Amino acid sequence: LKEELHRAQKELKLKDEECERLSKVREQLEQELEELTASLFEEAHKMVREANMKQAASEKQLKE
Amino acid sequence: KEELHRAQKELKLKDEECERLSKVREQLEQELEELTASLFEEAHKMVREANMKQAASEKQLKEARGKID
Amino acid sequence: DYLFKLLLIGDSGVGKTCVLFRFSEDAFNSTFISTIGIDFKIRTIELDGKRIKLQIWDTAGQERFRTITTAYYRGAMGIMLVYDITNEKSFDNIRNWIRNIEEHASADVEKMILGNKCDVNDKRQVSKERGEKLALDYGIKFMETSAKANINVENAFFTLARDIKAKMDKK
Numbered sequence: 001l002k003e004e005l006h007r008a009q010k011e012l013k014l015k016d017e018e019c020e021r022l023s024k025v026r027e028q029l030e031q032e033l034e035e036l037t038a039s040l041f042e043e044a045h046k047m048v049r050e051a052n053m054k055q056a057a058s059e060k061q062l063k064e
Numbered sequence: 065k066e067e068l069h070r071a072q073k074e075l076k077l078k079d080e081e082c083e084r085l086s087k088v089r090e091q092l093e094q095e096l097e098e099l100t101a102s103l104f105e106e107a108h109k110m111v112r113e114a115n116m117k118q119a120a121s122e123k124q125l126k127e128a129r130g131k132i133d
Numbered sequence: 134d135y136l137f138k139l140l141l142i143g144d145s146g147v148g149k150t151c152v153l154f155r156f157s158e159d160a161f162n163s164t165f166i167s168t169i170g171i172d173f174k175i176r177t178i179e180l181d182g183k184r185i186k187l188q189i190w191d192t193a194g195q196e197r198f199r200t201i202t203t204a205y206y207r208g209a210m211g212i213m214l215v216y217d218i219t220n221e222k223s224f225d226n227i228r229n230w231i232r233n234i235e236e237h238a239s240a241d242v243e244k245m246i247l248g249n250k251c252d253v254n255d256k257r258q259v260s261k262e263r264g265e266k267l268a269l270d271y272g273i274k275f276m277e278t279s280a281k282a283n284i285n286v287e288n289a290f291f292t293l294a295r296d297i298k299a300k301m302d303k304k
């Protein structure tokens with residue numbers, strides 16, 4: 001009769017701890033994504049500031 | 065059966081959570097893909113502008129270097 | 134020799150991004166915060182001799198990148214909460230945002246409230262006093278600022294970074 005609860009709880013332990021594991025990896029996944037997206041933006045920015053300073057350079061040659 | 069009455073609840077819940085966590089794998093790269101795609105577009109639109117206003121700006125340093133020389 | 138990962142959050146149109154660009158001393162207005170809702174900037178500073186790299190994420194709360202923006206909350210060492218003193222619900226919400234920080238971010242993270250646009254007193258709706266009480270209740274630091282006039286931006290970051298470092302040299 002009680003056997004159903006007996007299983008249910010054994011089942012809760014397994015799911016509780018698989019859940020813990022699963023979270024350690026969400027943590028990594030996120031650090032990696034940060035580091036990657038970080039550098040993505042870094043570049044996008046660097047690359048834009050080049051195109052603009054290029055325009056500025058011959059902007060000033062033209063006012064002189 | 066008071067214990068089970070509600071014991072099954074966190075089991076449903078804990079489980080429902082594990083499910084959501086596994087999704088977290090692909091849900092990251094799914095978003096990443098989009099974000100990357102976007103930057104590409106947006107940073108381009110940007111560099112496009114700079115180029116058009118640099119290049120048009122370039123041909124009058126020859127036209128005005130030509131109005132002098 | 135140190136790398137601090139920082140995050141700026143709060144309601145939209147609060148000034149979060151100008152706050153950033155000011156501190157990052159970028160000579161341009163050019164951002165992706167409008168068309169993406171994320172932006173990123175670095176600055177290295179000296180704190181008691183040492184070089185400190187600061188990595189500042191600017192998020193804008195769009196569900197389009199919910200999952201990614203958590204990655205920023207989860208990995209952030211210091212997170213500035215920003216409201217606009219010209220606007221109440223920005224301030225009212227500062228609790229809501231604290232819920233998130235508490236809920237999405239780490240247990241010991243360093244926090245700081247930044248009542249922004251202080252420079253404009255004529256349209257002020259949120260008293261400074263009321264702002265420092267908010268802060269003291271939650272037991273975190275508070276600081277009024279102005280991205281445009283350049284008031285206390287730099288002091289805010291240096292301040293936050295000192296709190297971070299001091300916490301780390303303890304361990």
Ligand SMILES: Nc1nc2c(ncn2[C@@H]2O[C@H](COP(=O)(O)OP(=O)(O)O)[C@@H](O)[C@H]2O)c(=O)[nH]1
Nearest residue numbers: 144145146147148149150151250253279280281
């Ligand atoms: N008076 C004043 N206006 C500001 C200040 N900071 C930002 N703004 C203006 O507020 C508007 C939106 O600010 P923004 O940085 O986009 O807020 P975000 O969306 O949270 O980054 C723009 O018109 C900014 O120029 C400030 O310190 N003082």
